[PDB]
Amino acid sequence: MNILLVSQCEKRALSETRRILDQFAERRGERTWQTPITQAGLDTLRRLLKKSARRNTAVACHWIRGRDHSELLWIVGDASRFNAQGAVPTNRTCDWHSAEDIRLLTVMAALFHDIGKASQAFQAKLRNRGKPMADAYRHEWVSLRLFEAFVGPGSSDEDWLRRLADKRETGDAWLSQLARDDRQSAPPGPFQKSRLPPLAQAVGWLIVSHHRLPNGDHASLARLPAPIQSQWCGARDADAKEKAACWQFPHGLPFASAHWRARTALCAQSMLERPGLLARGPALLHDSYVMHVSRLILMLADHHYSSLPADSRLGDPNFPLHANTDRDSGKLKQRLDEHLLGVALHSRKLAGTLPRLERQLPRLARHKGFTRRVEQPRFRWQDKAYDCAMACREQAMEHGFFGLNLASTGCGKTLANGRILYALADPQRGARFSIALGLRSLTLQTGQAYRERLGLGDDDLAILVGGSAARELFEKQQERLERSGSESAQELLAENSHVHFAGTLEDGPLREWLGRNSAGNRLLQAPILACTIDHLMPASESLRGGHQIAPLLRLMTSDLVLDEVDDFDIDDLPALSRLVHWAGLFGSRVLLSSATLPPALVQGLFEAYRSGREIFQRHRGAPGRATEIRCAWFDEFSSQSSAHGAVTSFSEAHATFVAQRLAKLEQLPPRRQAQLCTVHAARPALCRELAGQMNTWMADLHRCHHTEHQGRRISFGLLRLANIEPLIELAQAILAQGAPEGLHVHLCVYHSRHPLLVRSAIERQLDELLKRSDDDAAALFARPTLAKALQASTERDHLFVVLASPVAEVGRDHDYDWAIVEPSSMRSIIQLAGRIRRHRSGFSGEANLYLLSRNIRSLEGQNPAFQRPGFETPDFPLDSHDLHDLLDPALLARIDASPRIVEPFPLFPRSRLVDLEHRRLRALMLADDLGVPLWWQTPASLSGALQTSQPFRAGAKERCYALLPDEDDEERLHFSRYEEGTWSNQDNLLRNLDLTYGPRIQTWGTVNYREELVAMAGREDLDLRQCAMRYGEVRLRENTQGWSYHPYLGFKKYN
Amino acid sequence: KTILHSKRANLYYLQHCRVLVNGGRVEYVTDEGRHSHYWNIPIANTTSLLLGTGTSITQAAMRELARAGVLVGFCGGGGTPLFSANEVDVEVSWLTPQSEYRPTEYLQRWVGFWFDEEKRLVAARHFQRARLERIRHSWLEDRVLRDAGFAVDATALAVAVEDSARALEQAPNHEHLLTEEARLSKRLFKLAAQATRYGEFVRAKRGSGGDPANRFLDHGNYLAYGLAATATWVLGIPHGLAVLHGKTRRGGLVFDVADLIKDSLILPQAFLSAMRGDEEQDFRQACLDNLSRAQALDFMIDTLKDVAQRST
Amino acid sequence: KTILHSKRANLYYLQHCRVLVNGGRVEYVTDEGRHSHYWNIPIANTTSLLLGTGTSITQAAMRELARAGVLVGFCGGGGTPLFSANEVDVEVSWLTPQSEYRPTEYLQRWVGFWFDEEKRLVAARHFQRARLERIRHSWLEDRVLRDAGFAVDATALAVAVEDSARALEQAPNHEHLLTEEARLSKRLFKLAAQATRYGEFVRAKRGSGGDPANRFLDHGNYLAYGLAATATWVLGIPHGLAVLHGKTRRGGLVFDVADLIKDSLILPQAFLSAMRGDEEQDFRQACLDNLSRAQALDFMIDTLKDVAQRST
Amino acid sequence: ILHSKRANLYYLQHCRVLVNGGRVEYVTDWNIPIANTTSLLLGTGTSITQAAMRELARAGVLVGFCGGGGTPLFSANEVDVEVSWLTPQSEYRPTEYLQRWVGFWFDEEKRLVAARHFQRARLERIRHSWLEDRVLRDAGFAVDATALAVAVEDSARALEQAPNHEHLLTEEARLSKRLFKLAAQATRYGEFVRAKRGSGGDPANRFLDHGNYLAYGLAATATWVLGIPHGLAVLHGKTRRGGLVFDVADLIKDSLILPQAFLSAMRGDEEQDFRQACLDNLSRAQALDFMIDTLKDVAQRST
């Protein structure tokens, strides 16, 4: 093709644009290039231009499609310099309604945020190079107490402001008015009654929660922030001397410094000048949006300035106090006045920067794969969904969005979600959205699959690999961070987590605070992000640390997709509801993408989103807009859309759409038939019996369903087990049992306990071998991996079996011929049914799905039997654990989303499985007979009480392990353990496992750890040990005895 | 000096801009929030302008426009008429130049034959005979459309066109001619939807459609109207002297002239752009390319000349 | 980073210039009497360079050229070889990059099968079988050439190709294969002259022709040689390991590889450019367009791969 | 100028090669035997003209553009084959070493024999440079003499048997691992572990990588002079890109590059000074001539 490159770059961007384009093209004018090129070369040039692109970069590429018709191919950089057709102007000449209030509050809280570091105890601890001694009181608490002292009890919201606005004021007698929690009589909390005016209370909450949320104990929630007490924020049991030491100020608070007092007076006068500012006091205090945006700015500014080197250009040069000491040497680094002034300056700069984030951040525009119409009648709902989203674009932008992608599995919902959220965007600017998969850990294979399905490169889509990590270093690293005096120096995001992005990171708007190659900067600069919901949960469920900044900025600057959102455990639902509420709070548009969404969960999530959107509309946009959420419904058959301002009309619309979808679902031909199997009731015997039965069962299923070509019969099957240790035991039992009779069996073990690179390799092989279609035998038998395995043996019959944990239900597009499934929950049954013959058409009528009568946890005699995963609890018990009673027999004829989408009536919550699931979901999410709505009905967002009462991913405390090669010898591998930024050595906890092979049974779809490790290290151009520590983690529960490891079976717990 | 009006390639659809004269140049201004951008309009190569929603023009700019014979029309945004006078709609309010003095032969022929109803139905039949021929030509006997993904069922198109011609030959009056035109347009829509594997297409009226095909058809109607108005003004014939669409549409000669190319070049390109995921600008440029390559303006001029000559 | 060597579009023939590095950029300088003009060379998009009469290169420029895998050849001006060693002529003195490390499988296959005379005549026959197929393809079963004025007599081309293939099947040794290739080339020249109504064409040797067809053929031979040298270097096979033209030409594998596209794409374009009154630059650009559109470099690489694989 | 008189090669630096009067004359801002064996190697600040190339072409003079001092070899003319099957009619001198290299290469036994010969030559060079010549030691590279001899003897006693290419590779790796520690002890640089992929920041690692680059360039020059392609490796795997270059360079890699790198790290010299010292040492030991002779001997002693 012939392309024409035109550059509108300026200043430093022009030099780099010339340097890059002079190598790919010939000049035609002063800023015009032109060359013949190929598609691959054009993509290479575009990616090179996008990698090193500043804010001034502006390059347009034209193309000649049809005579007298040029076509703009793409624009790299600032797209405002060209019109839609790519022309240039002949001459250029010269909505936040609460930005100023947030800026003033943030600056004032920054000035008063570390005023408690003037304590003699804190100064001594900073200067104490010897053995560290834990401070009795947290510096935030004494800062708040000093604010209370300065403001004076009962003082009006104007008196203290005017007093601080008087520069000619050095009345340190206000220190005598201070209280002391160390002193007896239990002084009242600074928030109770009238100890603080309604505004100083807001500033005090900002001060006291600039390192951690005031999580305490215990109507109390609705009265926040009043019930905050000294015991709520830190505090330790110490002798009276230590407690008293935190209150004496020998060198005086930073009030004598001229610059500090001048800036404080300037801020106070600016606040007083503001019309009506001192009137919204109670409104601002309880406003989640204002408080949380102010706290984000304050915390990010503090995190940035706590790492900067000492500056003698601001603050008293010979001030006696100090704020922190450099961790490298321990010498004092920053004076308290300089620290406070810098934190305030950066707070003001960030408050100014934030409104520009909707135009300064990279976006994805002009994509044709999202607008191109389809040619096959199968994928013709992806166009109805796109048209429905485009019909709503303007109303969605004006009022909000709550979409529901209820299309059945195998229909290609990822491209549909991408197209919907791209349609909702303004065509001139582009789209920015996140894909939050409902998985515990995202492998690189799933991210690459997302890139392939959406047709996006790594210059447009980033992947946040790995999973979120619960606080482990909270005891060790926090000690050093507090000793150095900079407790806000921990990274905004975790350490092992890596963002796989290769796009514009040069001149990002938030480069100054986030960094340049830091994982927060890549997380924010990526137009489209592929992460997990556990990565975005720290936005709303972060109690101690700055983990809430990057997810929150992503939420404010992007849309949201919740893939497989119902896969979350029932106990983790309130966290998801909070996340949806905050997504609606900061202006994001949420699209739920699941095929088995029950009505109760959808209603609760919609209520959360509407509640958040009301407060967002109260702060951003034209005032007076009515909260009419533009709800939309998408499915494989049609797409609707309507506005709803209450959960009363949205429920009716959802019920109508569900009824229509069920009516259209009934007429579908059957492609899956389920048969109940009764099993004969420790591990080495039960697993052996199961392996004995699953020989005849697999033989019967293969005989019923298979593929025939040249007299050779191959069939792909799946066996899903609830837990991993029983899965490994059953794998051993099958392996040391052999083929049933002349039926050569290839087994693949796939669970979540393998090394992440190993797991990704297994997924890569299974996603390439299990892609099927109608009448594909000729290509199926010609596939290399299949070819070698078939030719090696002489048996005409082959059984390619996959033994998988519940990790194979999400993100796996596999077409099996048959499946043997243990019962955990109806959603699992539906998802695994949606995978046997999911790509092929034509059913023989014979049973292809086999369900065991009872799960392993019931054979062992444990009660409740449906738990982890499951819904059965002692509070909601089941009268039976046999599938012959919990399931309606009419369901086995045709299994689809119908039992899950609709709510049966009357509810029998102790005899039917789906009835139990619906009863629990409607009991927790809505109400029925510590409620979720308290997150937005009461000011509970001001404390971490809800996050502790209803925790997320609670229970097991996993530890990170890896098979790290020895530093001296690469061949030798060591079982390590991430303890605190340092991989210890734990060879004593690992032992080899011996596997016995029966007649005619080998293993397929496996990988060697060493070969995969070296291959991925070479691919990523990283050190081999660094690659092992970055992408080879395994999370295992702490066991005293240890584990037994085999490459084909993963780590099995040993006792 | 400017190009001959029949040899001009550009056509401009403008929105949310301010058309004015800046330093002797006709330019339109778009507000970029903190800046105003001035974009030049090549008046010496533009047949006509179309000012959509949120546009405005000044007397100086309109004077320089009506000095190179550039027509100006006030259309409506999103494929919507200017307004809807009860049961009828007007799409473009044309501002034809009046200082330019146009040829005075075709106008005399038109006014001479126009006031006889039989001689005006003869003209409508001759107008439809060229529309059918050009439909046949473009859809079948030209390769450019086929090489871009248009694969029409030759037999079905042939039988449809033959039936339309047979109905035309036995047309008693204007109403049956209009009914036959509507039937042919609907069958052509179905055939074009099938040819580009577009799926199931149902034509929406008054710009109420949501699928790309309906929007692109409604947009391309404006380009057809602009070219037809240019041709009628160039020949000196007033817009009001219609032969077919004079019963319900003001300035019906524009619609009658535009019908010649509406179903032969706009229709395939609408579906081709829809299948390709094109935006409105890309579809507009593709349609302009199709019209310039096929010399649609010259065809309109020659057809008007032939009808006027055969009228005598 | 630079484009893959098989996905590069440009090719440069330079004359009366000075190739040097100016500010980190590879550029050539032309003296305009009172000024010197520096022109940039897109090394990241150029397959190879050709330096004709009055050129010169420096060590820095050659270092930057042999770092993106850009081959450099010293041809002769006016379609003339570099020199003539008595009865044989050498046209290009190739400077293949040596710091780049090339794949090591096809080279082993070539060196394994290359030293057997029978196994090397089998390779020559397989090379000619692809040349005939591509001649057929380009001349007959492609419309781009026909839409540009190339109207070959289908029956005559078919019978000529059939006779050439029949002679190939009964080839006893290399000499008869060369004779058959020469006969086919002469008959193809006659057919191409007739097809473009060029008149009476008689092929001139050693760049002695005066009519545009002879000059354009002599020039396009250089583009074919450049592409063939690029392909052979990319696969890692040395230029010297020839299969057909090793008896009289140094680095004969380049000529053997270039023969695949010399008679199928260069030949029609030479007469098309002559008939159009093109200069050498226009013919060069047209030939580069033809090669890029037909993916000639990919065809050469794939044919070399197929010959190497079938050799085993 | 005569880089390798055993192969008749010449190095031209800071001069413009042009033709005036029908004879090439190198007008520096020289009397060279222009014949079938001339093989010029243009260097820094040298420019050639088309007429110069023509007159160097009708003389059999292969021309290559090498870096500063001789390495790396950016691009060079391609050597032809003297096989009787082909009939190259020119003033060139086609080589006949590719024929023997192909004739012995495909049999794994002779390949292994040649690889063991390579390793023997490598070890002999180590023992000669480290012990027999004290110039490096006198320069400040005092060694543990006996320890180096013991290590060389162990390496030879391991390489003299244990067939299979992986065994030879493991033996070479062990020899290099011991040799690096011995050199570190000799120069007293302290503890040092080589950083693979050239990611080290210590002076030793970067100097070692620079020396690796120089040796690879020299090996490319030697193979181009002989005419053997880089693919036909003898030590490395058949799938390793440029295996023969690495195998040839390994002969002089550990013998010369390691001591000079450690001494330059001790002295704290700049990268340019270290590179100049390396080039001077390589010139002293006739490294290029040694690699050419070793390849020729390996080819001849396997027929």
Pair A695, A737: CB distance under 8 Å: yes
AA identity, residue D98: L
Strand (E) or helix (H) holding A272: helix A258-273
CA–CA distance, A911 with A883 (Å, rounded to integer): 10
Q: Does A22 touch chain C (CB under 8 A)?
A: yes
AA identity, residue A244: A
**Tokens 């949205």 belong to residue:** A650
AA identity, residue A223: R
Pair C297, C232: CB distance under 8 Å: no
AA identity, residue D47: S
**CB within 8 A of A497, min separation 6: which ones?**
A464, A465, A466, A468, A469, A519, A535
Residue to substitute from D29, D42, D50, D79, interface C, most C β-carbons within 10 A: D50
Question: What does the block give as tokens for B11?
Answer: 């056509």
Pair A541, A952: CB distance under 8 Å: yes
- For residue C153, say whether it is annotated as part of any ligand binding site: no
Q: Is D92 helix (H, G, I), strand (E, B) or coil?
A: coil
Put simply, the answer to whether A68 touches B277 (Cβ < 8 Å) is: no
Rounded to the nearest angstrom, the gap between the alpha carbon of residue C2 and the centroid of all alpha carbons in its chain is 23
For chains C and D, count residue pairs whose Cβ atoms are closer than 8 Å.
158
Residue to substitute from C43, C45, C70, C297, interface A, most A β-carbons within 10 A: C45
Could you tell me how many helices (H) and strands (E) chain A has, helices first?
38, 32
Q: Which one, of B2, B15, B5, B12, lies nearest residue B64 by Cα? A: B2
CA–CA distance, A325 with B57 (Å, rounded to integer): 67
CA–CA distance, A717 with A802 (Å, rounded to integer): 6
- C-to-N gaps above 2.5 Å in chain A, after residues: 94, 218, 681, 929
Pair B39, B30: CB distance under 8 Å: yes
CA–CA distance, A288 with A202 (Å, rounded to integer): 11
CA–CA distance, C141 with C136 (Å, rounded to integer): 7
Residue to substitute from C58, C70, C104, interface D, most D β-carbons within 10 A: C104
CA–CA distance, A317 with A137 (Å, rounded to integer): 28
Residue A978 to residues A473, A963, A964, A992, A1014: CA-CA distances in angstroms? 10, 11, 11, 21, 21
CA dihedral of residues C84, C87, C88, C91 (deg, nearest 10): 30
Please compute Rg for chain B using Cα positions.
19
CA–CA distance, A843 with C271 (Å, rounded to integer): 62
Three-class HEC string of A279-335 = HCHHHHHCCHHHHHHHHHHHHHHHHHHCCCCCCCCCCCCCCCCCCEECCCCCCEEEC
**Tokens 């060697």 belong to residue:** A1008
DSSP of chain B: ----GGG--EEEEE-S-EEEEETTEEEEEEE-SS-EEEEE--GGGEEEEEE-TT-EE-HHHHHHHTTTT-EEE--BTTTB-SEEETTEEE---EE--SSSPPPSSHHHHHHHHHT-HHHHHHHHHHHHHHHHHHHHHHHHS-HHHHHTT----HHHHHHHHHHHHHHHHT--SHHHHHHHHHHHHHHHHHHHHHHTT-------STT---SHHHHHHHHHHHHHHHHHHHHHHHHT--TT--SSTTSS-TTHHHHHHHHHHIIIIIHHHHHHHHHTT--HHHHHHHHHHHHHHHTHHHHHHHHHHHHHHHH-
Put simply, the answer to whether B36 touches A94 (Cβ < 8 Å) is: yes
CA–CA distance, A601 with A777 (Å, rounded to integer): 43
- For β-strands B25-31 and B36-40, DSSP reports them as antiparallel
Pair A837, A672: CB distance under 8 Å: yes
**CB within 8 A of D153, min separation 6: which ones?**
none
CA–CA distance, A886 with B240 (Å, rounded to integer): 78
Interface of A with B in 419-438 (CB under 8 A): 427
Question: What does the block give as tokens for C276?
Answer: 């159009």
Rounded to the nearest angstrom, the gap between the alpha carbon of residue A992 and the centroid of all alpha carbons in its chain is 36
Strand (E) or helix (H) holding D138: helix D135-138
- For β-strands A712-720 and A818-821, DSSP reports them as parallel
Put simply, the answer to whether A427 touches B293 (Cβ < 8 Å) is: no
Residue C208 to residues A97, A179, B25, C51: CA-CA distances in angstroms? 83, 108, 57, 21
b/e per residue, C14-34, with b = 16+ CB within 10 A? Answer: bbebbbbbeeebbbbeeeeee
**Tokens 């794998």 belong to residue:** A731
Q: Is D5 helix (H, G, I), strand (E, B) or coil?
A: coil
Q: Which one, of A924, A267, A260, lies nearest residue A574 by Cα? A: A924
For chains A and C, count residue pairs whose Cβ atoms are closer than 8 Å.
50
Contacts 24+ apart (CB under 8 A), A873-881: A873/A920, A876/A909, A876/A910, A876/A916, A876/A919, A876/A920, A877/A910, A878/A910, A878/A911, A878/A913, A878/A916, A879/A910, A879/A911, A880/A911, A881/A854, A881/A855
**Tokens 């004006």 belong to residue:** A398
Q: Is C18 helix (H, G, I), strand (E, B) or coil?
A: strand
Cα angle for residues C98, C100, C102 (degrees, 5° grid): 100
CA–CA distance, A772 with A841 (Å, rounded to integer): 11
Residues of B in contact with A91 (CB under 8 A): 22, 37-38
Q: Is A633 helix (H, G, I), strand (E, B) or coil?
A: strand
CA–CA distance, D128 with D133 (Å, rounded to integer): 6
CA–CA distance, C130 with C123 (Å, rounded to integer): 11
Query: How big is chain C, counted in residues?
Result: 312
- For β-strands A629-634 and A402-405, DSSP reports them as parallel
Residue A135 to residues A236, A241, A244, A474: CA-CA distances in angstroms? 8, 11, 11, 16
What phi and psi values does residue D143 have, to the nearest 5 degrees?
Answer: -120, 175
**CB within 8 A of B117, min separation 6: which ones?**
none
Q: How many CA atoms lie within 13 A of A877 on its CB side?
A: 6
Q: For this experimental structure, what is the resolution in angstroms? A: 3.5
Residues of C in contact with A44 (CB under 8 A): 1-3
Q: Which one, of A880, A737, A885, A895, lies nearest residue A801 by Cα? A: A737
CA–CA distance, B55 with B17 (Å, rounded to integer): 5
Q: Name the burial class of residue D78, with classes exposed (0-12), middle (13-18) and buried (19+) by CB atoms within 10 angstroms of its CB.
A: buried
Residues of C in contact with A40 (CB under 8 A): 3-4, 7
What phi and psi values does residue A459 have, to the nearest 5 degrees?
Answer: -85, -15
CA–CA distance, A806 with A824 (Å, rounded to integer): 9
Q: Which one, of A291, A289, A340, lies nearest residue A316 by Cα? A: A340
Put simply, the answer to whether B274 touches A373 (Cβ < 8 Å) is: yes
Question: Can chain C be said to touch chain A, i.e. do they have 3 or more Cβ pairs within 8 angstroms?
Answer: yes
Residues of D in contact with A1021 (CB under 8 A): 197
CA–CA distance, C136 with C165 (Å, rounded to integer): 11
**CB within 8 A of A394, min separation 6: which ones?**
none
Q: Which one, of C261, C245, C243, C248, lies nearest residue C308 by Cα? A: C243
Q: Is A979 helix (H, G, I), strand (E, B) or coil?
A: coil
Question: What does the block give as tokens for A145?
Answer: 């107490």
Q: Is A634 helix (H, G, I), strand (E, B) or coil?
A: strand
Residues of A in contact with D199 (CB under 8 A): 1023
Pair A19, A48: CB distance under 8 Å: no
Cα angle for residues D130, D134, D138 (degrees, 5° grid): 120
Pair C62, D201: CB distance under 8 Å: no
CA nearest B33 in A: which residue?
A: A94
Question: What does the block give as tokens for A271?
Answer: 């606040």
In chain D the first and final C-alpha atoms are separated, in Å, by 34
b/e per residue, C190-210, with b = 16+ CB within 10 A? Answer: bbbbbbbebeebeebeebebe
In chain A the first and final C-alpha atoms are separated, in Å, by 66
Residues of C in contact with D49 (CB under 8 A): 55-56
CA–CA distance, A989 with A1043 (Å, rounded to integer): 6
Q: Which chains touch A (3 or more CB pairs under 8 A)?
A: B, C, D
Q: Which chains touch C (3 or more CB pairs under 8 A)?
A: A, D
CA–CA distance, A287 with A281 (Å, rounded to integer): 10
In chain C the first and final C-alpha atoms are separated, in Å, by 35
* C286 beta partners: none
Put simply, the answer to whether A85 touches B276 (Cβ < 8 Å) is: no
* D42 beta partners: D12, D65
**CB within 8 A of D115, min separation 6: which ones?**
D165, D168, D234, D235, D247
CA dihedral of residues D146, D151, D154, D160 (deg, nearest 10): -110
CA–CA distance, A183 with A244 (Å, rounded to integer): 8
Neighbours of B72 (CB within 10 A): 22
Pair A525, A499: CB distance under 8 Å: no
